[PDB]
Protein backbone atom coordinates (compact mmCIF):
# COMPACT_ATOMS: atom_id res chain seq x y z
CA UNK A 1 0.00 0.00 0.00
CA UNK A 2 1.07 3.61 -0.60
CA UNK A 3 0.90 4.44 3.09
CA UNK A 4 -0.88 7.74 2.39
CA UNK A 5 -2.09 9.85 5.31
CA UNK A 6 -5.18 12.03 5.47
CA UNK A 7 -2.94 14.98 4.63
CA UNK A 8 -2.38 13.63 1.08
CA UNK A 9 -6.09 13.04 0.35
CA UNK A 10 -7.19 15.24 -2.55
CA UNK A 11 -9.65 17.67 -0.96
CA UNK A 12 -7.44 18.23 2.12
CA UNK A 13 -4.80 19.55 -0.31
CA UNK A 14 -7.30 22.19 -1.39
CA UNK A 15 -8.80 22.99 2.03
CA UNK A 16 -5.43 23.52 3.72
CA UNK A 17 -4.89 26.47 1.34
CA UNK A 18 -7.76 28.22 3.11
CA UNK A 19 -5.30 28.93 5.95
CA UNK A 20 -1.72 28.09 4.86
CA UNK A 21 -0.28 30.25 2.02
CA UNK A 22 1.79 28.88 -0.91
CA UNK A 23 1.28 26.68 -4.00
CA UNK A 24 1.31 23.15 -2.45
CA UNK A 25 1.26 23.54 1.33
CA UNK A 26 -0.09 19.97 1.88
CA UNK A 27 3.43 18.64 1.33
CA UNK A 28 4.58 20.50 4.46
CA UNK A 29 2.00 18.57 6.54
CA UNK A 30 3.01 15.05 5.57
CA UNK A 31 5.73 13.17 7.43
CA UNK A 32 6.42 15.64 10.20
CA UNK A 33 6.77 14.78 13.89
CA UNK A 34 5.46 11.48 15.17
CA UNK A 35 1.93 11.72 13.71
CA UNK A 36 1.78 13.67 10.44
CA UNK A 37 2.67 10.57 8.44
CA UNK A 38 0.29 7.62 8.20
CA UNK A 39 -0.74 6.83 11.78
CA UNK A 40 2.05 7.33 14.32
CA UNK A 41 3.38 6.44 17.78
CA UNK A 42 4.94 8.03 20.84
CA UNK A 43 4.09 11.47 22.18
CA UNK A 44 3.34 14.24 19.72
CA UNK A 45 6.42 16.48 19.49
CA UNK A 46 4.66 19.83 19.15
CA UNK A 47 1.25 21.49 18.61
CA UNK A 48 1.23 20.85 14.86
CA UNK A 49 1.95 17.13 15.54
CA UNK A 50 -1.00 17.07 18.00
CA UNK A 51 -3.21 18.38 15.19
CA UNK A 52 -2.03 15.45 13.02
CA UNK A 53 -2.79 12.89 15.72
CA UNK A 54 -6.33 14.23 16.06
CA UNK A 55 -6.74 14.27 12.25
CA UNK A 56 -5.62 10.64 12.10
CA UNK A 57 -7.99 9.70 14.91
CA UNK A 58 -10.78 11.45 13.06
CA UNK A 59 -10.20 9.46 9.87
CA UNK A 60 -10.02 6.24 11.95
CA UNK A 61 -13.43 7.09 13.36
CA UNK A 62 -14.64 7.74 9.79
CA UNK A 63 -13.71 4.17 8.84
CA UNK A 64 -16.65 2.92 10.96
CA UNK A 65 -19.08 4.35 8.39
CA UNK A 66 -20.08 1.99 5.60
CA UNK A 67 -19.76 4.68 2.91
CA UNK A 68 -16.19 5.36 4.10
CA UNK A 69 -15.05 1.96 2.74
CA UNK A 70 -11.71 2.38 0.87
CA UNK A 71 -10.84 5.64 2.66
CA UNK A 72 -7.04 6.20 2.61
CA UNK A 73 -6.39 3.45 0.02
CA UNK A 74 -5.35 6.31 -2.27
CA UNK A 75 -5.94 10.07 -2.47
CA UNK A 76 -8.93 9.83 -4.83
CA UNK A 77 -11.61 7.68 -3.12
CA UNK A 78 -13.69 10.40 -1.54
CA UNK A 79 -14.35 13.99 -2.44
CA UNK A 80 -16.65 16.52 -0.86
CA UNK A 81 -17.76 20.11 -1.23
CA UNK A 82 -16.67 22.95 1.07
CA UNK A 83 -16.21 26.72 0.93
CA UNK A 84 -13.89 28.94 2.94
CA UNK A 85 -12.94 32.49 3.84
CA UNK A 86 -9.68 31.91 5.69
CA UNK A 87 -10.33 29.80 8.80
CA UNK A 88 -14.11 30.25 8.33
CA UNK A 89 -14.58 26.89 6.56
CA UNK A 90 -18.03 25.52 5.74
CA UNK A 91 -18.64 21.86 4.88
CA UNK A 92 -21.46 21.77 2.35
CA UNK A 93 -24.84 20.55 3.67
CA UNK A 94 -25.24 18.45 0.47
CA UNK A 95 -22.30 16.21 1.41
CA UNK A 96 -23.20 12.55 1.97
CA UNK A 97 -22.45 10.83 5.30
CA UNK A 98 -18.79 9.87 4.74
CA UNK A 99 -18.03 12.96 2.68
CA UNK A 100 -19.43 15.21 5.44
CA UNK A 101 -17.52 13.37 8.13
CA UNK A 102 -14.12 13.64 6.42
CA UNK A 103 -14.84 17.26 5.43
CA UNK A 104 -15.28 17.97 9.10
CA UNK A 105 -12.08 16.06 10.02
CA UNK A 106 -10.20 18.16 7.45
CA UNK A 107 -11.81 21.41 8.65
CA UNK A 108 -10.87 20.69 12.25
CA UNK A 109 -7.29 19.90 11.12
CA UNK A 110 -7.01 23.04 8.98
CA UNK A 111 -8.18 25.24 11.87
CA UNK A 112 -5.78 23.44 14.23
CA UNK A 113 -2.89 23.90 11.80
CA UNK A 114 -3.71 27.63 11.35
CA UNK A 115 -2.77 28.06 15.04
CA UNK A 116 0.25 25.70 15.29
CA UNK A 117 3.77 27.05 14.69
CA UNK A 118 5.64 25.28 11.92
CA UNK A 119 8.87 23.92 13.39
CA UNK A 120 11.07 22.95 10.44
CA UNK A 121 13.34 20.82 12.67
CA UNK A 122 10.44 18.35 13.08
CA UNK A 123 9.88 17.68 9.36
CA UNK A 124 10.91 14.04 8.82
CA UNK A 125 11.86 13.71 12.48
CA UNK A 126 13.73 10.48 13.28
CA UNK A 127 10.67 8.54 14.45
CA UNK A 128 12.78 5.56 15.51
CA UNK A 129 14.45 7.90 18.05
CA UNK A 130 11.70 10.35 19.06
CA UNK A 131 8.42 8.43 18.55
CA UNK A 132 8.80 5.30 20.63
CA UNK A 133 5.82 3.85 22.48
Swiss-Prot record:
Activity regulation, per record: Regulated by bile acid salts. Up-regulated by cholate and down-regulated by taurochenodeoxycholate. Cholate-activated rate of hydrolysis is lowered by hypolipidemic drug ezetimibe.
Keywords: Autocatalytic cleavage, Calcium, Disulfide bond, Hydrolase, Lipid metabolism, Metal-binding, Phospholipid metabolism, Secreted, Signal, Zymogen
Disulfide linkage: 18-84, 34-131, 36-52, 51-112, 58-105, 68-98, 91-103
Posttranslational mods: Activated by trypsin cleavage in the duodenum. Can also be activated by thrombin or autocatalytically.
One term of GO molecular function: calcium-dependent phospholipase A2 activity
Coiled-coil segments on the chain, per record: none
EC code(s) of this entry: 3.1.1.4
Entry's Gene Ontology cellular component terms: cell surface; extracellular region; extracellular space
Keyword Hydrolase: yes
One GO BP: cellular response to insulin stimulus
Pfam families the record matches: Phospholip_A2_1
Cofactor(s) needed by this chain: Ca(2+)
Reactions that this protein is recorded to catalyse: a 1,2-diacyl-sn-glycero-3-phosphocholine + H2O = a 1-acyl-sn-glycero-3-phosphocholine + a fatty acid + H(+); 1,2-ditetradecanoyl-sn-glycero-3-phosphocholine + H2O = 1-tetradecanoyl-sn-glycero-3-phosphocholine + tetradecanoate + H(+); 1,2-dihexadecanoyl-sn-glycero-3-phosphocholine + H2O = 1-hexadecanoyl-sn-glycero-3-phosphocholine + hexadecanoate + H(+); 1-hexadecanoyl-2-(9Z-octadecenoyl)-sn-glycero-3-phosphocholine + H2O = 1-hexadecanoyl-sn-glycero-3-phosphocholine + (9Z)-octadecenoate + H(+)
Positions that bind Ca(2+): 35, 37, 39, 56
Co-factor: note: Binds 1 Ca(2+) ion per subunit.
Subcellular location: Secreted
Active site: 55, 106
Domain of life: Eukaryota
InterPro entries: PLipase_A2, PLipase_A2_Asp_AS, PLipase_A2_dom, PLipase_A2_dom_sf, PLipase_A2_His_AS
Tissue distribution: Selectively expressed in pancreas, lung, liver and kidney. Also detected at lower levels in ovary and testis.
Group of enzyme by EC: hydrolase
PANTHER family the record matches: PHOSPHOLIPASE A2, PHOSPHOLIPASE A2 FAMILY MEMBER
Known role: Secretory calcium-dependent phospholipase A2 that primarily targets dietary phospholipids in the intestinal tract. Hydrolyzes the ester bond of the fatty acyl group attached at sn-2 position of phospholipids (phospholipase A2 activity) with preference for phosphatidylethanolamines and phosphatidylglycerols over phosphatidylcholines. May play a role in the biosynthesis of N-acyl ethanolamines that regulate energy metabolism and inflammation in the intestinal tract.
Family listed: Belongs to the phospholipase A2 family.
Name of the molecule in the record: Phospholipase A2
Organism of provenance: Homo sapiens (Human)
Originating gene: PLA2G1B
